[PDB]
Ligand binder design. Structure first.
Ligand SMILES: CO[C@@H]1[C@@H](n2cc(-c3cc(F)c(F)c(F)c3)nn2)[C@@H](O)[C@@H](CO)O[C@H]1C(=O)N(c1cc(Cl)cc(Cl)c1)[C@H]1CCC[C@@H]1O
Length: 138
């Protein structure tokens, strides 16, 4: 059990076959969660569950370059529940991030930021109790 916000170092950035696992529990009155894979100030991959955007639940993904958000990729399939334990797994592949939640595939996000070996931090924020954040190579 760790304090949020939390920054997990990714030394030398990410590489294909790297599997990042975030474990925690969604808070009971959760509104938002974010994962931010950063290259300096740039956000290579922002993964953002929203629990109440116009009274519905949505996953928003985007990239931030030079402090500007790009074109959003949205998904209505929403595997999180307020109050429940979750596992987010981000698998780095050569051309995309692949996300699975609770062992079920959720989405893919094509690499907009190309310098994977400079994506050297993961920020974790929002309405969760964070249990652990770690990575391994599959
Ligand atoms: C509130 O800003 C959103 C961004 N964001 C979220 C968080 C955040 C999340 C957490 F879970 C958390 F815990 C935390 F601490 C911080 N920090 N930054 C990002 O989530 C960003 C992703 O595109 O969206 C921003 C956004 O809400 N919009 C937005 C989209 C674009 Cl492209 C351009 C601008 Cl100027 C705005 C709206 C406008 C209308 C529809 C669109 O979705």
């Amino acid at each position: 059990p760790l304090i949020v916000p939390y920054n997990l170092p990714l030394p030398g950035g990410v590489v294909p076959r790297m599997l990042i696992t975030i474990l925690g529990t969604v808070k009971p009155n959760a509104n938002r969660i974010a994962l931010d894979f950063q290259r300096g100030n740039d956000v290579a991959f922002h993964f953002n569950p929203r629990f109440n955007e116009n009274n519905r639940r949505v996953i928003v993904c985007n990239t931030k370059l030079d402090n500007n958000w790009g074109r959003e990729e949205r998904q209505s399939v929403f595997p999180f529940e307020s109050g429940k334990p979750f596992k987010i797994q981000v698998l780095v592949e050569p051309d995309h991030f692949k996300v699975a939640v609770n062992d079920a595939h959720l989405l893919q996000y094509n690499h907009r930021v190309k310098k994977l070996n400079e994506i050297s931090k993961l920020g974790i924020s929002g309405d969760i109790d964070l249990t652990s954040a770690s990575y391994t190579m599959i």
